Amino acid sequence: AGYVSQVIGPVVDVRFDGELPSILSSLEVEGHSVRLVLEVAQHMGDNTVRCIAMDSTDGLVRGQKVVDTGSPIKVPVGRGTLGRIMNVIGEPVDEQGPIDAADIWSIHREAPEFTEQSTEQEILVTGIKVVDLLAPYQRGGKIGLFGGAGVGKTVLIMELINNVAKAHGGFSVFAGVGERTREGNDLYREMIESGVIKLGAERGNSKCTLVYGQMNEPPGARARVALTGLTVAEYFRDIEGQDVLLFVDNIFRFTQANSEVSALLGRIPSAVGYQPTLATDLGGLQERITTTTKGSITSVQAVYVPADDLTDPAPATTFAHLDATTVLSRSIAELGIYPAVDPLDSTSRMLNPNVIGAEHYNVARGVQKVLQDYKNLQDIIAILGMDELSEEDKLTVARARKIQRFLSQPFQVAEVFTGTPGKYVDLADTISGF
Amino acid sequence: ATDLGGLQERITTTTKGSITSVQAVYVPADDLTDPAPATTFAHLDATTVLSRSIAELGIYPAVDPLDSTSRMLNPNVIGAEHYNVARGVQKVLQDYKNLQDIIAILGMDELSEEDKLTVARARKIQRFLSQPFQVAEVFTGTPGKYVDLADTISGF
Amino acid sequence: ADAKALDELRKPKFSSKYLIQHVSQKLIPAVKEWEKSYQPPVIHLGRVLSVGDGIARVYGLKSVQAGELVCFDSGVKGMALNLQADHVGVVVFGNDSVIHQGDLVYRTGQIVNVPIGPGTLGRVTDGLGQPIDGKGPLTNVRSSLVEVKAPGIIARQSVREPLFTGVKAVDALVPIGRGQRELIIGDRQTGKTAVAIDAIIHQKNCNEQVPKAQRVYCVYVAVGQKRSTVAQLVKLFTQTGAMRYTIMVSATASDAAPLQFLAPYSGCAMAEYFRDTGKHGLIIYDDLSKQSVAYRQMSLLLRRPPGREAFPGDVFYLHSRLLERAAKLSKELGGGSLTAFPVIETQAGDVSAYIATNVISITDGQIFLETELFYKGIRPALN
Amino acid sequence: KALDELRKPKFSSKYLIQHVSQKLIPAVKEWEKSYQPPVIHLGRVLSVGDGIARVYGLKSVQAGELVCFDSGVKGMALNLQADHVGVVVFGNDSVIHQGDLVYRTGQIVNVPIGPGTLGRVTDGLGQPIDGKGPLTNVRSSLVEVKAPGIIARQSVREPLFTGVKAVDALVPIGRGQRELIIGDRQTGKTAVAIDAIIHQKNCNEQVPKAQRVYCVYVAVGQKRSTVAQLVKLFTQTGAMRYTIMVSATASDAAPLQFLAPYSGCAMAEYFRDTGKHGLIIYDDLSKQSVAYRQMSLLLRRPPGREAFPGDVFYLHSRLLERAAKLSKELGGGSLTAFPVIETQAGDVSAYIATNVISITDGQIFLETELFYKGIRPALN
Amino acid sequence: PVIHLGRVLSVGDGIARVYGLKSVQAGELVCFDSGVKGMALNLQADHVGVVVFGNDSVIHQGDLVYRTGQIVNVPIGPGTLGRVTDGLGQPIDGKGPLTNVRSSLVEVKAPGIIARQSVREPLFTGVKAVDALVPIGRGQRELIIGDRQTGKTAVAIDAIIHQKNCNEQVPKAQRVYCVYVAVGQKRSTVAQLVKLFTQTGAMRYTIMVSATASDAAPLQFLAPYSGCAMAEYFRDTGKHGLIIYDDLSKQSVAYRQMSLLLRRPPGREAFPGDVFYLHSRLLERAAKLSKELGGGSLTAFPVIETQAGDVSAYIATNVISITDGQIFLETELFYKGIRPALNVGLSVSRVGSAAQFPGMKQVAGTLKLELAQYREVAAFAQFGSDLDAATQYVLERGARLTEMLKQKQFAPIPIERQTVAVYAATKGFLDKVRVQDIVAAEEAVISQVNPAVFKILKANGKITPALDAHLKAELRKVKLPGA
Amino acid sequence: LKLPTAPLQLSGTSAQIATLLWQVAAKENQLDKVQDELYQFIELFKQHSELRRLATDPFVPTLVRTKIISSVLKDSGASEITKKLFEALADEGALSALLEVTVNYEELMLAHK
C-alpha cells in the first residue's frame, strides 16, 4: 500500500497514499532478493515515512511496493526459541528449521510501570563464590562485565546460564549486539559442547536463546537486536514468570549502532559525536530490564570503555544504570585463578549492610581489606625480602594467599574439557566458609 | 586526497623521459598529523622531514635524521656499505634519544661507559650531519661545502 | 518580483471572464465527487503535518498561545514551543510513536500546568502531574503554571531560619538556610541522594514537633533515574512516614526528554504552593545534570546550534530560572520559603565542567562529596 | 485580503522546472510529435561536479546499480531521491555535461572472478591495467555480497604462515581470521604484508593443491610508481603466479578507491567459496575510508565525528566480515584478511582506527620508536 | 550621470540585502539614502549583499540604495601625516578635512617579482632585543606574535618613536613615515597613543588609522587595507614606510562577522575559507621596490594575539606562514623581569643579518650563540643536580646577556649605543659585575664612554680596527657599580 | 530544439517557470491569451476558497489535487498552455506559485513591447 520514495544508504523513504504507519512499525518491501524489513523512524510529511532498513538496501527501486504490517517488529518468543539462533527480525539463523513459537511479541514496549515495579532489592545467588561475596548480583539489576579475551569470559557466561537455570529455574537470552561472526560461532559451538544448548530432539532441554546481530548487518539491525533479546527475556518474565538472565554482549556496540542510526537520520550529534538521544536510547533499553511482580530480568552486559576513558559519555551513561561491575583481569588469570574476577576492582551496589545484612557485609568488607593490605606491600617484598617483614604482616600474606586461592572454583560447564567436576557454592556456605 | 592525487600522479618518470621532483611541504603547526602533509607522504619516494628541534639546536640543515625516509635505502639498491652505515647512524641517534630522557634529569654519570660512549658518538654524528650551504653564506657566514657520496660514507 | 508588484495582483485586471464563470459552475460539482478523500478542514484545531524526534509540526491551531498545553487525539500532551507562520511545532510530553501525520491536535487553552495543592501531598506523579502511584486521581488540588517567574527583589527577605538537614557534616559545617539553594555536587556513587534523603526523613521527625507554621513539606524530583530506584525510594518514604509530607515527581530514564526537562518545573510549581501560602518547602532536583542532558536532546533535535559541551547555550537559563524560584518570601507575601537542593553528577571530580559551573554560579553554596573520602569510609564524604 | 495565503510559495522539489518543462513543451503544436524525454531507463544530467552527477529521470534504477553515461564513462546510482539520482562517477567528470544522457545498465557492480584473474593487475573495477589483454578465464560476480553467516563458518584452526618471526611466534594468524596491520607511516606495514604474499609462494610449491593459498593485494590510494614497483617485485620472486593485484591509485576517482577493497574481496572470495584458501591484503583501509568520506560529503549525506558517514563502520565491517573460514559442507575454504590502517602519531583512538580494531580479531601494531632502534619488523 | 537605484529587501546585524543594483561591481561603494555608506560584497542572482559602514538602525525595508560607481578608496598623500583617521580615510581627530591628499583604492594588487629588489637596508626598531637577535630590514614583514599583555604594542610603538629620532639625523630620502592601524581597540587606548605620539613628537611622521571596537565590522576588516594604502603612498613615491597592523587577530574576527552574516559557510573556528587570502593579500603589499620603481619600501608589523601561548591557532598559523620573521613574546619571560619578553629561541628573522647593522653583525653573532648555550644549561641547573665550571661560565655569562637585552618601555636606544652596550657584554667588559645591576651598569657604559666615539661608529657603521681597540681602551676607563 | 529567447533573464524556481511559460506562448503567438488566462486565475482564487485550498492546504491528496484542476479546465478557455501548466503545478503542489509566476510573466511581457 506504500511505495519506495527515496533510498539513501540504509535510510529508505516510503510514501503511503493512504494512512501512514506508526513510528517504529515494521514495513516489508514486497519483492526483493532477501527479506527486507524497514522500521519507521519518523513521519516526514507529504505522506512520506522515513525508515531504517534491517538489511541491505542494494537493489531497491523507487516505486517498489512496501507492505505495512500494522505493528512493530514481531519476533517468536517462548520455550521453543531456546537453543535457537535468531536474528533481529526473528528469523532462524541456526539452520534448524522454523522456530516453534509460543507467541509473536512486538519488540517495542514501554518499561514496566511504577505499580508493577519491585521495591525489595534482593540478591541473585549465582553459585560463584567471588561474585556472591565480594560483588553480589542484584536480582533485576544490570551488571557490567569488564572481561576480554582469555580471561575465561565465555566460561563465566555459560556458568551463569547454568547456575541460574539449575537453581533459580530461569532461562537465559544472549543478545549478541554487533558481534563478530567468528566469535558468535565460537560461542554457539562452545554452548553446544558444554550442554547449555542442545540440538535435535533434545532441543527443549537447552537453557539459552541466542539473538544475534552481526557486524556486517546494517546499523539499524544492530541497534534493534538488543530489543529482540529483551522481548524473548520479557516473555519468560511476564508469561513464564521466571528469573531470566540476559546477556547484552557489548552494550557499547548497542550505543555505537544507535549513534550510527541517528547520524544517518540527519540528527545533529551531541558531545563527543554521540547521538542527542544517547541517554534515552540507552535508558529505553535498560528500564525494561527490571524486577516486576511476575519475575525478573537480570542482565550481564559486557562493557567496553572507548579510549580507556571512564568519563566518555557512552560508559558514563551506561554506568548510571549498572548495579554491579565484574572485572575480569589477566593478572588474576595468570595465577591460575578461575574465574578471573578481580576481588578488589569488582564493585556492587548490593554491597552495603542494609540489603545483604551485617554478617555478609563484614565478611566481604573484611576479605577485601585483607587482599588490599597484601597487594600494596608487593613493592616492599621484592626490594626488602619475603622473610624481612613482621610476623603480623606475613600473617596477612598467608591469610590473603589462601583467600586469593579460595576465590577459585571449578565450573560445571567446564568439566567436559578440564576433568574436574563443577561445584555450585551456596551463599551461606560462602559467608561461613570465608 | 584526490585533488592532490591528480597532481602528483602526473609528476612521474615515464618511458619517454624523467621528472625528478622536489616538493617543499609546509606542515601547519609543526604537525605532520595534519591531513594536508599526511596525504603527501604516500606520494613521495624520499621524505626529508625538517624539525624545529634540530633547528633550535643550531644544526643546519635541520633534517630529522630518523623521520627522513627514502625508498633508496634498501641494501640491494645502494649497496651494503651505504645501507649499514645509514642503519648504524640511525641506531646511535635513536639510542641517544632514549638516553636523553635520563641525561637531562641525572647528568651522564650512571651509564656504565657503554652508554656514555654512544652519547659522545651520537653528539659527533649530530654535528657531522650539519653542513654549510653555498646559498646560506649570507646567513651562516661560512662558504658552502659540497660533500661527495664516498666522503660521506667514509666519514660516518 | 517586488512587493509593490504583487499587491497589484489584488485588484482585477483581466476584463475577460470566459473561464472565471466556466469553472465556477464546474468547481463545486468537481469538489463534491472527491469528498471522501478530503480530510475535513482545520482552522482552530490542529492537524499533524510531521512527527519525529519527539517534535510534531502541527498545521492549523490558529489561536494557540506560545507554550500552551495541546492535546493530541491519542491522549498525549504537548507544548506549543514555536508558533510559526505555516505550522506550530509542539514537543510531545510522551512517546511520539503514537502520533501520526493527520492526527487531530486539540487546544486546551491553558499554558502548561500541573495540579498543586494539599491533595498532591503524599503522591507519586510523573513529569506532568499525572499520578503514577496507582491510587487514583489527584483530588483537593488545582492547576498552576510550571513556568511562573521567580519573585523579584522586593518580594524577598534574607534567610533567617535554620532548616536542619539531620546530617552531622551538613548542619555543623555547611548549614542550610530556609530559603536557600544548596548544590549537592559530587561524582557517581558518593551519597548524593543519601544527603537529600536524610534531609527529607529529618523533616518528618521535626514536623510533628513544630506548631504548624514551621513545618517543611518536601518535594523530591527524580530526572533520568531508574524506575526501580524511584520505587525503592517511595517505599523508604512510606515506611519512615516521610511520605505524608513529601511529593514525589518522577521522570525516569525511559521517559521522554521533554518529560524530564519539565519535571523540575512541575515539581517546583507543586513546592511553590507551600512557599506562596506561608508554609515552607524543600525541593530536591536529583540529577539536574540529567535534566540538562534531556534539554540538550530537545535542542539538538530542534536543530539549535552545538555549544561549549554541545549544550544549547540557554542551558544556564534552564537552571537559573528554575532555581531562582527557591526564595525566602517577605512578610507581606506570607513569609513562606522554598529551599532547593539541586544535585549535579560530576565526571572524575572535574568541577570545571559546563553544567557544574553553571549551577555553582546560580546556587548559594555547595556540598562537595569527594569520591576519595567516600572510598575510605568517611560517609558523608563532605569535602 | 483573501489572497495573502498565496503570497509566498513553497516547493517540495528543487527541480520543479524539469517537471514543468516535461508538460509545457510537449503542448506546443510542433513538439507534440517525436519530442518527449524518456525517464524510465534513461536519464538527463542536471548537475555535474566533483565526480557527482545529479541525474533527472532513471525511474527504474536500483540502489547501487551501475549506470552508464553517453560518453562511455560509468557510474553508480548511489542516492536514489524522489526527483533525481545522485550518481558517483567512475572516472573524470569533465567529460560529463548538463543534459547528457545517462543509461542504466541493469546491473549492480560486477568484477571478473576466477582463475583468469591470477597474475593480472586490475583496476578498482576489475579491468586489467597491465596491458596483457582482457581477462580470459573468468566469470562475472557481484561486488557487495553478503558475508557468510554463523552456520557457514567453522573454527579457525589452520595456521597461516607470514614468514615473519615476530608475527608467527607472538601474533599467530590462522586461515580465516582477519588481522589488522596498524602503524604509522613507513613503519613496515607493507613489509609485513608483502612478506606474507611472498612466503605463500614458497609454501605453495611444497603442499598439496587443496592447501595452497592464493593472495590478493588491494592497493588503495597508492601511486602507480609504488604499485609498479610491487608488480616488479612480485614478478622477480615469482609470487605473481598466485597473486591478484587490484590497484585503485591516487589519480583514480574516489568511487574507484571505495570499490576496490570490495572488488578485490570478490576476486578473493572465489577461492574461499571453492574450497581453496585466500589471502586478501588491503594496502590502506584508511585511504579507502577517505575516498568514501569524499563521496558522502559530496552527495550531502550527514557528516559524522571526523566528517565520515554514519555507516563508515558498516563500510568496513561488511567488507571485513567476508573473511571467514568456511565449514566442511561449504568446501572448507578460507579467506584471511590483512587490513592496513595508517595512524598519525600512533594513536589508535582515531575514528577509523577504532572501527577496524573492533571488526578485526587481532592487530599487529608497528611502532616507529622501535623502527629506529634497529627492530624490524617494529612490532609492538 | 545616470545613477542605478537598489531597493533594500531586508536589513539586519549590519548587513542589508538589496534588490536591483545589477550594474554594481563587486566591492563597490554604495550609498544608502540615510547617508550611511556600504560595500557590495556578494552579488547574488536575486539580491546584493551589502555590508554597512556604520549603524544599520537608520536603514529600513524599502530604502533607496544608490551606487557610487567606485570601488572603495581612501585619501592618500602627505596630508594624512599627523591626522587620526577612521577605518576608511575620514579624520576623527577634529582638525577639519584632509588637505593636500588624493583618493586611491584600498585593494591594490601587490607588487610582483620584477618590481622588487632585495631587502638590504636596516629598519632599526630601537629595541636592542630586536635589533641584535631578530633584525628587520626595510621591506620586510615581521610578525609580533604574543599573549594578551606581553608588550607586543610596546615593541611596535618603540619602532614608531625611534623613527622620529632617526628622521632628524638622516637626509630627506631615507626617512621612515609610520602608519599605525589600530583594529578593534578601545578608543581610550588609541587616544593614549596619539597623546604619546604628540608628546614624543612622533606624530609628525605618523598616520593613525583607527577602527575601534564601536565601529562596524566592515570598518575594522577594511582598516588594515586603508592604512596600507596610505602607507603605500610613501613606498610608491620613493620614500620609506612603516605600517603596523595592531591586532590583525581582531581584523579576522571582524571579517568572520561579515562572512557569517553574509551566510558564507564557516571553516575552522567559524572562519571564512579565504581568511588566509585576507592576510596574504595585505601583507604582500609590504615590499622593497626596485630602483626603476623608486627604491621605496614598506615595512609591515602585524600583531597577532595568542590565547595561552597557542601559536598553533588558525589565524596565528596563517600569518607565521606569510611573514618573513617573527617576534614571539612570552608571558613567563615577561614576569621573570625580562622586558621586552622576546623568546629568543623562537624568534627568527628570515632576512637575517643581510639587512642589519654591520657594527652589530659582528658583535651580536656571539650574542645569539652564547644565549643558545645559556638556554639548555639553565634547564639542567633548574633541578639542582651538579656543576661543571665550564657549564657555570656560560650559565653566568648568558645571565649577564639576558640582563643586557632588557630595555625601558618608552625609551628606544640608537643603533650606535646598542652595539657599544652589546660589545661591553660580549667582550667580557661587564664581567666582574653583579647580575642584578647590569640594568643600571650600562647607563655608565653609555654616558662615561665618549659622545664622539658613537659618531665614528654611526658614520662608519662598523667597528674599524682603529675603533675596535680605541673603545675597548675606553671600556676600561669607566666606573661601574660595585666593581 | 530551439525556443524563443526571453527578453530579460530572471531568477529561479518561480521566475524560471514564467520564462518557460513565456517561451511556449511566444512560439504559439499566445502571449496575451495565456497572460489574461493567468489574471482570471488570480481572480479565481479570490472567489473560491476551495480552489485556493488546492494550493495552501497540505492535506489534500495529490490524486485529488490533479483531478480537480484537470476536471474544471475542460471545454472552455483551454489554450493548451494554461491547461498543461496548471496540471504540472498541481502534480507538484506548486499551485501557490501562481501569484509569483504571474508577476514574472508581466515583466517578460512588458519587455516584449
Ligand SMILES: Nc1ncnc2c1ncn2[C@@H]1O[C@H](COP(=O)(O)OP(=O)(O)OP(=O)(O)O)[C@@H](O)[C@H]1O
Ligand atoms: N552515610 C552513608 N553511610 C553508608 N552508606 C552510605 C551513606 N550514604 C550513602 N551510602 C550508600 O552509598 C551508595 C551510594 O550513595 P548514594 O546512592 O546516595 O549516592 P549518589 O550520589 O546518589 O549516587 P548515584 O550516582 O548512583 O545516584 C548507596 O548504596 C548508599 O546507600
Ligand SMILES: Nc1ncnc2c1ncn2[C@@H]1O[C@H](COP(=O)(O)OP(=O)(O)OP(=O)(O)O)[C@@H](O)[C@H]1O
Ligand atoms: N624488516 C625490515 N627490514 C628493513 N627495512 C625494512 C623492513 N620493513 C620495512 N623496511 C623498510 O622500511 C621502509 C618503509 O617501510 P614500508 O614502506 O614497507 O612500510 P609502510 O608502513 O607500508 O610505509 P608507507 O607509509 O610508505 O606505506 C622501506 O624502505 C622498507 O624497505
Ligand SMILES: Nc1ncnc2c1ncn2[C@@H]1O[C@H](COP(=O)(O)OP(=O)(O)OP(=O)(O)O)[C@@H](O)[C@H]1O
Ligand atoms: N619593555 C617593557 N618594560 C616595562 N613595561 C613594559 C614593557 N613592555 C610593555 N610594558 C608594559 O606592560 C603592559 C603591557 O604592554 P602592552 O600593552 O604594550 O602589551 P600588548 O601585547 O599590546 O597587550 P594588549 O593585549 O593589552 O594589547 C603595559 O602596561 C606596558 O606599558
Ligand SMILES: [Mg+2]
Ligand atoms: Mg542518586
Ligand SMILES: [Mg+2]
Ligand atoms: Mg605501504
